[PDB]
Design a protein around this ligand. Structure first.
Ligand SMILES: Cc1cc2nc3c(=O)[nH]c(=O)nc-3n(C[C@H](O)[C@H](O)[C@H](O)COP(=O)(O)OP(=O)(O)OC[C@H]3O[C@@H](n4cnc5c(N)ncnc54)[C@H](O)[C@@H]3O)c2cc1C
Length: 453
């Protein structure tokens, strides 16, 4: 086990109780560096391990589509962790008040959590640190290369972060050891009841159409660790050979569809990369997929980790802030409100059909995710309003929302983060522009619109 994956958040006197794993971002039992590191520490202290998840008060800021997908994967996770004599405890409330209470009530010896560069996770760590006296560690179980190890600063481009990650791949890209079960079983409600009351609280804000029927379709992505692997195997055997040539065509189902499992941590990217590297296929398709799950996925964590204002206008590059400021007073072609963007009531049918795919499936195609956010910048009163509208609609309706990938993907489309300067236009400035005629020359836009009426 590599010691460069674990960081120390607070020193203190070790207790004589079970080692607590505060699971948050990585909700899986297999291939979860934070969970094996909690097991070896407890094996060294002659004590068992205990998994603790917190059902926060911010679950209503999203929708039912994310509340059911996450909880249904935990019901499978609770059954999974029990076979290895690893009990799980699901607390409801503020993590700062619940984790600090569980540590004192259960006489915890060492607290361990997974890594997440989001601001809400740093808020929980600050309150938890102030209420505990036991050692507190964090382990990067989401990236193949630890976020603090791949680079010591913010990388402004993908071509300057690529040789750093690939140079550290031979050391960190490795096979996972088997999770050892607890020697003996050690010494706050059912997840079905917490799902029934939570869905009841989210029902008045459900996404409906005019016929009062729900818009979300839950049969597109089944949640769980078992379903995550079956999607990975189907992509390797059916979709990866044609990925490099059909990844920018939204009319084809050629993407791996692993982001709802990668966001909630139901499948490990290191596990997918290991299966991808050992699969024989198109080298241009393998290179394109690894560039998406290794470079662009972990550079998003690098963005949110080294930029406190990753969701603001101040984190944009200097050339983009100067260009957007010189094109702010430009008369926009159209100005729609957040409700018109949410209901897909724009003059552009491609943007509306893209929004409908987001409303109905919860996972908009990767190429249309570019056109969807850039048109928000073109049809907003300011770049800041375009940031607020894009983030709100992205985090509310996307299954993989509230993730550093979306914040870095939105900052690319509006602020040009990890991009370069293009031809200067009005309103948008030197930000890369995607037109409706350009997408017609790339894929059948009529088929993508007719599919999402
Ligand atoms: C405006 C906008 C909004 C986005 N919204 C989200 C979001 O809410 N949540 C989210 O996790 N990602 C988001 N992305 C990134 C990207 O769209 C998705 O990661 C990708 O589409 C996920 O679907 P997939 O698994 O079928 O893609 P695949 O082609 O199968 O790629 C597999 C994995 O590689 C990673 N990856 C691929 N493309 C990107 C990318 N452009 N950026 C970061 N990682 C990538 C993802 O982890 C992805 O799961 C967004 C990008 C933009 C420009």
């Amino acid at each position: 086990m590599n010691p460069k994956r674990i960081r120390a958040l607070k020193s203190g006197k070790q207790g004589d109780g079970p080692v607590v794993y505060w699971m948050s971002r990585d909700q899986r039992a297999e291939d979860n560096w934070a969970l094996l590191f909690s097991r070896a520490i407890a094996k060294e202290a002659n004590v068992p391990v205990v998994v603790v998840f917190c059902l926060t008060d911010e679950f209503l800021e999203a929708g039912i589509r994310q509340y059911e997908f996450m909880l249904k994967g935990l019901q499978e996770l609770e059954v999974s962790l029990s076979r290895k004599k690893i009990p799980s405890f699901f607390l409801r409330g503020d993590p700062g008040e619940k984790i600090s209470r569980f540590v004192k009530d259960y006489n915890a010896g060492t607290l361990v959590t997974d890594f997440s560069p989001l601001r809400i996770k740093n808020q929980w760590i600050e309150k938890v640190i102030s209420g505990i006296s036991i050692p507190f560690f964090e382990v990067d179980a989401h990236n193949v290369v630890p976020c603090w190890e791949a680079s010591q600063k913010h990388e402004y481009a993908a071509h300057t972060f690529r040789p750093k990650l690939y140079a550290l791949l031979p050391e960190f890209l490795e096979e996972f050891p088997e999770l050892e079960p607890n020697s003996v079983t050690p010494e706050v409600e059912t997840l079905s009841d917490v799902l029934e009351t939570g869905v009841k609280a989210l029902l008045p804000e459900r996404a409906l159409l005019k016929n009062k029927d729900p818009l979300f379709e839950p049969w597109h992505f089944e949640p769980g660790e078992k379903a995550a692997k079956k999607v990975m195997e189907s992509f390797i055997a059916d979709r990866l050979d044609s990925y490099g040539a059909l990844r920018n065509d939204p009319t084809k189902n050629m993407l791996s569809n692993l982001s709802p499992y990668l966001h909630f941590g139901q499948i490990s990217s290191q596990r997918v990369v290991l299966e991808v590297e050992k699969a024989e296929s198109n080298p241009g398709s393998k290179k394109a997929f690894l560039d998406e799950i290794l470079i662009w996925k972990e550079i998003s964590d690098n963005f949110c980790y080294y930029n406190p204002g990753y969701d603001g206008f101040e984190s944009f590059p200097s050339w983009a802030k100067e260009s957007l400021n010189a094109h702010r007073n430009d008369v926009r072609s159209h100005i729609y409100t957040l409700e018109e963007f949410e209901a897909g009531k724009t003059h552009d049918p491609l943007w509306n059909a893209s929004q409908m795919e987001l409303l109905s499936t919860g996972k908009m195609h990767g190429y249309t995710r570019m056109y969807w956010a850039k048109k928000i910048l073109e049809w907003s009163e300011s770049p800041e309003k375009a940031l607020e509208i894009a983030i709100c609609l992205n985090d509310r309706y996307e299954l993989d929302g509230r993730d550093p990938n979306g914040y870095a993907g939105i900052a690319w489309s509006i602020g040009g983060v990890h991009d370069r300067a293009w031809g200067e236009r009005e309103v948008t400035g030197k930000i890369r522009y995607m037109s409706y005629e350009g997408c017609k020359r790339k894929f059948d836009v009529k088929l993508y619109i007719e599919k999402y009426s």
